[PDB]
Amino acid sequence: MLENIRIVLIETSHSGNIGSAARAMKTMGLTQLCLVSPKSVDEQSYALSAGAENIVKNARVVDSFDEAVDDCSLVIGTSARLRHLQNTLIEPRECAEKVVAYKGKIAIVFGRERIGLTNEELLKCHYHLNIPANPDYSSLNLAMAVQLVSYELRMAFLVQNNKKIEKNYPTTDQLAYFFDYTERIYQSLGFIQNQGVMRKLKRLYYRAKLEKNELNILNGMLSAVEKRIDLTK
Amino acid sequence: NAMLENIRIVLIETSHSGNIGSAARAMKTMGLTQLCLVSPKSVDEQSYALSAGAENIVKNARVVDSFDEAVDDCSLVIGTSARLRHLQNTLIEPRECAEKVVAYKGKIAIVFGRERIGLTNEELLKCHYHLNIPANPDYSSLNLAMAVQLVSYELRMAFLVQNNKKNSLSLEKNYPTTDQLAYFFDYTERIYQSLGFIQNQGVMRKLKRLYYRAKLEKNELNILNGMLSAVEKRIDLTK
Structure with a gap:
């Protein structure tokens, strides 16, 4: 209501x-x-x-x-x-x-x-x-x-x-976490240097309207990268 | 002004x-x-x-x-x-x-x-x-x-x-070429196989579907290629 x-x-x-x-x-x-x-x-x-x-x-x-x-x-x-x-x-x-x-x-x-x-x-x-x-x-x-x-x-x-x-897809906390997760990692990699990257990234991913399945995969990719970063300090 | x-x-x-x-x-x-x-x-x-x-x-x-x-x-x-x-x-x-x-x-x-x-x-x-x-x-x-x-x-x-x-219709005559996006997919694949993440062709298939559905702008492709290079540098620094 x-x-x-x-x-x-x-x-x-x-x-x-x-x-x-x-x-x-x-x-x-x-x-x-x-x-x-x-x-x-x-x-x-x-x-x-x-x-x-x-x-x-x-x-x-x-x-x-x-x-x-x-x-x-x-x-x-x-x-x-x-x-x-x-x-x-x-x-x-x-x-x-x-x-x-x-x-x-x-x-x-x-x-x-x-x-x-x-x-x-x-x-x-x-x-x-x-x-x-x-x-x-x-x-x-x-x-x-x-x-x-x-x-x-x-x-x-x-x-x-x-x-x-009506369509089940990705919840907003799952997605904002995907962003933060994305932000942490690529900041760590020396790549993100201001808000601009994260602005384009969200504008793109909204447009695509990520399926739950898609969010899953992009998330497993972050982890694989984090594993290598975490296995390098 | 005002109409x-x-x-x-x-x-x-x-x-x-x-x-x-x-x-x-x-x-x-x-x-x-x-x-x-x-x-x-x-x-x-x-x-x-x-x-x-x-x-x-x-x-x-x-x-x-x-x-x-x-x-x-x-x-x-x-x-x-x-x-x-x-x-x-x-x-x-x-x-x-x-x-x-x-x-x-x-x-x-x-x-x-x-x-x-x-x-x-x-x-x-x-x-x-x-x-x-x-x-x-x-x-x-x-x-x-x-x-x-x-x-x-x-x-x-x-x-x-x-x-x-x-104003805005004149303001995205820059979309990547077929080869640019294709290069990006092989690059994603290679890198994520290098990591040990990819085990089957389904990941790439779902990714292409996602990115084609998106219709990447050239500057978006630029960012994503830039992330893969960022990850690559790190891989190349470990072993």
Whole structure:
């Protein structure tokens, strides 16, 4: 379900925004709202929720970011395209596709009304979600950003349910391990000297859509090489 | 630039003057600039306040008394609507809708009907397509600003994907030759037989299948040949 997604708002300054976000969530089928030290949750939150009062009432209220995301193994924060976030920057479409496919708890984290998220809060996210926007005017209202992300989450959920089609292949930990395994070895061999190799390698292996059998063989090859490396220090 | 400027956003009878502001803001975040109001109930400081830096859009908005004037000079007209069964032939959702707008060689009005009322029979008949936003069946009413934000966003995404297309087709005239890939397979074989990994021809067969299915780029082949050389140097250093 959309039930494993927690929507987290950090220090919402305007209490109406919380109602608007509850409404936007409910409109798309989301329910789990989390507020990290909201400035206030009040009659204005309840009024703007307009039928989504249940989402507001059931909101988890916590005093910290870490508390908000304590049992989520995937954490995504909304961000501007800051230079230092370039390797983990993603957009809502790809994000929605990642999320709907994820096994486990996911938190999507929206920052403060003007400021967004601090770098320290950003460091606590695995991916950084950027909404493509007018470069001259690229900050959304907090509830509208939630509305758009909630909307791509439902588009992705529906597309997936249109097939539920079905094919057992390779699981994502098996594959990310294949990467790390590949990275360790070829780094050891003097070959990998930056991220570029591992970027092309994943772009290739996705395209191929490795069968479980194929992952097996590429894995046995790593081991055979490791044996020789390990049998040479 | 923007061919987002050939798109007029029309808001039918807005109520709270703040809603005009919140819609102008949503538009500006996505690069839309043309706003038209039909008989707004009121426009005042709140229309400006809620625009949050999108005042220009509110200042320049048209204000008319009729749907006909509101869509003057637009030959593609899209009205938002509930999933009304009698409109089944012309109902579309925001993704398909944006692809059509973006390929439309003329001016387009997208008309946002009144919250929880929609458009009249006459107004619906005057739309070429009817735009419904997939939503919770149990709670499907977007307020005005939410609806404009989402349609504007799909519009911008349609615009970007179309402009990414116009560039990238020219941008992979480098695929390896048959002999290059073949050389790579014999090289993989030799090396992995040298290791003591290969015992039967099935490994190579499955590998060719994999790599042919992949359709290796020349630079990908380069990397993979580079790994085999990396492994080779190590083998050649042991014995």
